[PDB]
Amino acid sequence: ATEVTFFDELKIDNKVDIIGNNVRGELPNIWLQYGQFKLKASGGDGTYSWYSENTSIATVDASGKVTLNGKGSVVIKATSGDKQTVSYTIKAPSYMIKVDKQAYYADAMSICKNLLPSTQTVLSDIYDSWGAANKYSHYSSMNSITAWIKQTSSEQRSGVSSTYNLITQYPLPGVNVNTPNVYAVCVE
């Protein structure tokens, strides 16, 4: 006959831990596909288990680390050992960035069905919200991710287009359309 413990009500912290930049704040409105973050649970008996109501949109492991997989809204549930369950909802993003294979500008256009990032900000804003792409499991191997930017009217005339690197923040204008080592990043 030992003594009993008492717990507070289970609560999922609204403050999210973004793996890429060590930021503790709400989930970014704009998404990097396969970006990751740690949901912080509290209360209960300290032991939790996580569940996704839709893997197509997002997945979650045993540590609370959530991986974004698709554009949309999904509910994540945390269950403490003492039989408490709490919901945390993921609001769909304004847009999400996808990284396909490397290609020339023209090909990248068709690949992304003409949904290449409209400006450098579309891409740089994602770095500000998530940080270096390779800090995430899905991109760990890569050291550089150069992405096409939608070429301006003048750029289309000269056969070039500027680029932005999702890891190095490196901007680069006047890149010939038929340049290798450039990823087709679809903005959806």
Author numbering: 747 to 934
Show passages lifted from the paper.
Intimin, an out membrane protein expressed by EHEC and EPEC, is required for intimate attachment to the host cell and formation of the A/E lesions. The binding of intimin to Tir mediates the adhesion between the pathogen and its host cell. The intimin of EHEC O157:H7 is of γ-type (designated intimin-γ), whereas that of EPEC is intimin-α. Here, we determined the crystal structures of Tir-binding domain of EHEC O157:H7 intimin at 2.8 Å, together with an Asn to Tyr mutant at amino acid 916 (IntN916Y) at 2.6 Å.
In this study, we solved the structure of EHEC Int188 and its mutant IntN916Y. Crystals of EHEC Int188 and IntN916Y diffract X-rays at 2.8 Å and 2.6 Å, respectively. R-free values were separately refined to 29.6% and 26.8%. These two versions of intimin (Int188 and IntN916Y) were crystallized in space group C2 and P212121, respectively. For the native version, Int188 consists of four molecules in the asymmetric unit while the IntN916Y is present in two molecules per asymmetric unit. Recent study have demonstrated that four important residues (S890, T909, N916 and N927) of EHEC intimin are essential for Tir recognition. It clearly indicates that these four residues locate in the Tir binding pocket which is formed by B, C, D β-sheets and the loop between D, E β-sheets. Int188 and IntN916Y behave completely the same at the level of higher structure (not shown). For the mutant, IntN916Y, the folding mode is completely the same as the native version, which indicates that this amino acid substitution fails to influence the alpha-C backbone in Int188.
